[PDB]
Amino acid sequence: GSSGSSGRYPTNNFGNCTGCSATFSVLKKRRSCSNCGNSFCSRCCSFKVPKSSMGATAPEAQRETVFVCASCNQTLSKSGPSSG
Ligand SMILES: [Zn+2]
Ligand SMILES: [Zn+2]
């Protein structure tokens, strides 16, 4: 018997960052992750990571660097579960 099911609305927080929940003021710009594709501040989406080893490998993007959110950058860096 193993438990691990979330029973919450199918929607996710909005209007603010999905990491530090820091509203995007006139100064802050709502950025967009490259991996997960979620909204983040200018402090969470400040992580550079390769796309070649993100999900789809191609002879085009090899030495490229994309911006991702900490939450992801951390998951991508270390290995473990099936990227999804
Ligand atoms: Zn943030
Ligand atoms: Zn992300």
Swiss-Prot record:
The gene is ZFYVE27. The lineage of its organism: Eukaryota, Metazoa, Chordata, Craniata, Vertebrata. Can form homooligomers (monomers, dimers and tetramers). Interacts with RAB11A (GDP-bound form); regulates RAB11A. Interacts with FKBP8; may negatively regulate ZFYVE27 phosphorylation. Interacts with VAPA (via MSP domain); may regulate ZFYVE27 retention in the endoplasmic reticulum and its function in cell projections formation. Interacts with VAPB (via MSP domain). Interacts with REEP1, REEP5 and ATL1. Interacts with ATL2, ATL3 and SPAST. Interacts with KIF5A and RTN3. Interacts with RAB11B (GDP-bound form), SURF4, KIF5B and KIF5C. It comes from Homo sapiens. This is Protrudin. A zinc finger (FYVE-type) spans 11-77. Phosphorylated. Phosphorylation is induced by NGF through the MAPK/ERK pathway and modulates interaction with RAB11A. Zn(2+) 2 binds at residues 33, 36, 69, 72. Zn(2+) 1 binds at residues 17, 20, 41, 44. Key regulator of RAB11-dependent vesicular trafficking during neurite extension through polarized membrane transport. Promotes axonal elongation and contributes to the establishment of neuronal cell polarity. Involved in nerve growth factor-induced neurite formation in VAPA-dependent manner. Contributes to both the formation and stabilization of the tubular ER network. Involved in ER morphogenesis by regulating the sheet-to-tubule balance and possibly the density of tubule interconnections. It is found in: Recycling endosome membrane; Endoplasmic reticulum membrane; Cell projection, Growth cone membrane.
